[PDB]
Amino acid sequence: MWHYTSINNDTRVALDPKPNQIRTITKPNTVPQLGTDYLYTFNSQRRSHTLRLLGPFQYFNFSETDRGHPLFRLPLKYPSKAIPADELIDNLHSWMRSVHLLHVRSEDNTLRYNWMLGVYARSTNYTTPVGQLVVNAPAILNYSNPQDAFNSVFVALGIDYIDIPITNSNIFDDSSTPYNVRIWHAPTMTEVNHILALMRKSTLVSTHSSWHWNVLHTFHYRSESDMIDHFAAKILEDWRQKEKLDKGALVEADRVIQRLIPLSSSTYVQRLAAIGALYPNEFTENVLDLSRLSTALLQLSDTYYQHANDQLRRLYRRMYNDSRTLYMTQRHQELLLAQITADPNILLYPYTYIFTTIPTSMNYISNTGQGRIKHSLTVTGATEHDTVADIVLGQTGEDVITISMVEPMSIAVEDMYGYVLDTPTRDIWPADEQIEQKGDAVALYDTKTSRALGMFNNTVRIDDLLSPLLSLVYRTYIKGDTMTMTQGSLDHLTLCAAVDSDITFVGNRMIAPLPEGYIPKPMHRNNSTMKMLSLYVALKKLENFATNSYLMAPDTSIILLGAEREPAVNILRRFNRNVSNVRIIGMGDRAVEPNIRVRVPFPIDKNISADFIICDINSYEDQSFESMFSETISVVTTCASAATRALVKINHPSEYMINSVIERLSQLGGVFYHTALLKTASQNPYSYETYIYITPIAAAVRFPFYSNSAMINRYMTAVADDEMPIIPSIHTVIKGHSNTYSPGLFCGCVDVQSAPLALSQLKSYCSEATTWRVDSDDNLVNIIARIDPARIALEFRTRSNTSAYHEYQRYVPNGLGFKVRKTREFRYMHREVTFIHKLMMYALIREQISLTENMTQVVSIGGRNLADISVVPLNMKYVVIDPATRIETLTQEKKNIEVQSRPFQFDAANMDLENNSIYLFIAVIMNEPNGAATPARMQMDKIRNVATAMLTRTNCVAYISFYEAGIITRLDQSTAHKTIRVEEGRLKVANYVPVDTLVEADVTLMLRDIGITHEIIRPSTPELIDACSNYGIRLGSTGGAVLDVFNHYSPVIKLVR
């Protein structure tokens, strides 16, 4: 598709009306209409009005009388706001009525009326010789042949040319015109040549490659800057046109070479003409910034003036030394020849040269316009690096980047009110177990739990996490934008938690509109409010699970036993206004009214009872463990005695403490208390504090004691740290292949030229990196990129430093972002619970692996996209056996990583386990490679097969992850599981198919029958803290509730030989 197909035409001639049409050309009878007769726009930002007449009127000189019309006075009358369409239409209409162009209507169909000379003569009020010639003989304006229209008047006047002023396009500006267009009497090509050659000896003149009305016309500039801005706009036009032509589309090019040909100009114009005629690749790639076009054009010229390509440089130089010559590619020239063959006497510019376009392979990425780029850096590339120098990142203002401490949660309102259960497992509590658990509980309470865990608990507050969601409900209710919801709905409870004023539905599912002028104050919530609310919802769901309404039943009561102001009692009182007779009271030692101020145990005289109790008692004072123990025992006892459904808090949920609770409940006469541990989503994500749930039932409870409960493990496994908590640093100096970085994030700015290099260097650490420039003019490019431990574990396996730097240099300068808006990164980004559990399991397995001695290799079967790479040490060889893994032989060879790329056979004969090897089977055992779930008996079968297969080799360690059965019992009873599910009895993590679960006892019994050594470990609190500290991940609430029961029920079998 080489040859251009374009239909050339003199568009400016086609615009000139037939003489018969001039009388009604203003359409005197009817109002001018927008979008047809005019275009008005008010740019409120620049506060500039802009009118633009359409049709023949787009070229209209205005007489000073026309300027005196009120229409042109309008923008002054409305300095700040748009001219109303009424006034604009009426003024433009009456002014339009005022205009009248001298003309003689005729019968011959061949005539056209010379609109230019007509309106021009009118504007000068018929004073100039053309104006006189016209007012005396209007019939002179009619023309058959377009050129003779002017020859008639040059002959009539005897003048060699007419200097005709240009109209401004907007009719509101009255600015003095940058140039004017002279029109020469040059009937033949020879006259055109002589005039051009004379013009090439006179200041500030230029011209088009061809002329409308087939009559020569030159532009004459008042100043050099005007010549520059004109040349710029024309170059842009010819580049857009040539771009459209090269795509091969048919196009109505009014003239084949749109750009101007300087005849006499300053140097800078000659540079514009030169790069302009190059049709440089940079325009198609949008490498230039068009907002400041001529500047960019001047800049482009300079590079072409000293271009690395000899061809382009000699070509540009040549064009610069012969500026008067028009340069064109051959594909243009054929269009010129076609245009000549159609109309033999057409005039076009005599002095021309046909250069061959020089190909250039540099395919720049680019995109002007808003949007930061979110890079995904490759581990490796074609480029080799040798000892790249450290790259400092600049200081950045808060106007560009800010770093908030924690990412606020995004979540549906219902998800906040969920909770998880953990039922008792042990059938008995033997005394030796009591002494052991007491020793662990006392040793643990005596020295406070991990300082890092307490840091995350004290930074990831639930109040701040839920504030952006809660206030959003306030702002919507405040506008009246909120509407339908059920009476008992959780969205209703959130609405109660947003605003201090009582709300009331006008009828079913319709909240009352606010009284006029009223803007109720948002409800005041302390950190524990929403948690108390979710405990209320929890007690409601526990009383019966099917319910959707959460209103209290009529004639019932609830007590929020720990209290200060306790906003929750007020919100709840407000929630139940439509329900008759519902006692609701806080009852703390620090209680303010409405709540009664009272100590627990209750004074013997005082009578207290309720259908529900929600204790949140917690001693602020430091105290002995025996005192805290007796206090919590008296608290749970008094809470259980006083209600049919207690929901006690436990600040120190050791196994010994909870078992002491169940034993003490056992000691009370005549009531068998069913019980369960619990954790709501509105708790602070990291708090180990756990809500025990007591309730009488007629039967004695089988398996009443706890052991290895998840909620308890969350607390007990945390212990005083051997290291200070890892504070997230903000790095600036990017060393080339260093591996000295503490977890945190790179953040800063570089020159746009250095930017491809800097991205290529930080791919060593960061797995991805957002970048952007603030504006087209500012040359600094901001970059943010958090450090991925997994990418460090990948890139530092060998000393080679490959990167896609060649690809990154396609970005400079427009290809890597723009964003005027301030951006706000968080030190702790959100991540889904499955991903977090995966990282915790990786921390557990990695710390476990570093202890192991003398093993040649790690083999992660089912490794996907090297997901387990964080686990393996930089030394020992890594292997993957996921069929779905993509191959990268350069990356594999460079990074010491074999990839089997075939399904792994679990059958013992097929098995080929090496000596001195660590076999990871993380989460792969539960699925077939095609993604369909494998039945649990088949899972147990393949585990048994891996066991017997590794039974023979002397040194090996398998890690078979799987899902324990008990979790399905718990999620059947829980609520807060936006991710995890229980479809038809199978776990359904993420988007994965539901998959049947193993029971831990049968698996352990099988491994004991095999005779192999094993140890069913699961990751604990310190592992969680390591994953969060390293990856820069805050937990989030729903994940905070679900994570313990989820983590406990993904056991990791650790076969060892």
Partner: protein, 49 residues
Amino acid sequence: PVEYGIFVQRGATYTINAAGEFEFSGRNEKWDQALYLSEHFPALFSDVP
């Protein structure tokens, strides 16, 4: 006074750039005829909106 503040914040004078864009001083200074032969122009007469 308001429009004047807004105007003179842009600059009391300007100079044409080699690219032909205007570049206003940003400074409020009284003009002298010594500037007539200089690169500088009075900013009142720029006719830039």
